[PDB]
């Protein structure tokens, strides 16, 4: 199966998932200086006030908090995007140390750990439709860095005691998505995949520019998490990210001057 290790990881997918390979592959490294700020990028609207969240799960690659996206509830619009995506859930990649666990770079700077929201495109009625379109998906791409305690984040914290193994899931009802959200909505954006097998070249990617931090005691206990399902030898759930992949023939556009 598919996973992070030796003889599984990233540089293993292609065979499996040929379009590992292909030519709008995610992540990648965000040269700073040559994305460009574009003018026809309409207003970012990030509206989670009626978010449903309804169950976390670890499913063996990382832990997935998982919303009702049954109607128009928490829902990304402008920037980029033409019409409506809807929040279907979040899930992070972080390291073993804090020095990796983005998936995106900045000018090759590696973050402890890179949060994504992820959305589908309304217009094709399900997630499983979206995914096969070119535009069907928006993944809101949040850094982390170590440092002050993010407030927001405790709650998902306190509940992977309870997750540990793959294949469990707890109640996660009443979690707002608001609390792990940077001060400012400024961004980079570019056309890209699914981070994880199938690697679906479906995504709109915006990644803000602004990290949110989290303390060393929370991404602690991302760390306790397991790979495995329950019974088995322990492998930590670490280093869950795969590396920057080839731009080719991409610009990356900024929100901002
Ligand atoms: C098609 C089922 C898998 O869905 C996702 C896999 C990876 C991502 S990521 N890591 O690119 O945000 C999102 C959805
Ligand atoms: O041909 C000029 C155009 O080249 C494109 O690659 C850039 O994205 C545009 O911003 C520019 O105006
Ligand atoms: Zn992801």
Redesign the pocket.
Known sequence: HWGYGKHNGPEHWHKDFPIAKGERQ??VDIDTHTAKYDPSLKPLSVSYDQATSLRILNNGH?FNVEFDDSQDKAVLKGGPLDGTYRL??F?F?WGSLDGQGS?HTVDKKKYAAEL???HWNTKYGD??KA?QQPDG?A?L?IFLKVGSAKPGLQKVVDVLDSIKTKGKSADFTNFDPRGLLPESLDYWTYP?????????EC?T?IVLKEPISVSSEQVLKFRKLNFNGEGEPEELMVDNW?PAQPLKNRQIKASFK
């Open positions: 995610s992540p990382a279907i859930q899930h990649h998936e994504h929201l992820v997630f499983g995914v998906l993944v791409g890209g995949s699914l981070t994880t097998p199938p690697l679906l995504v990617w795969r």
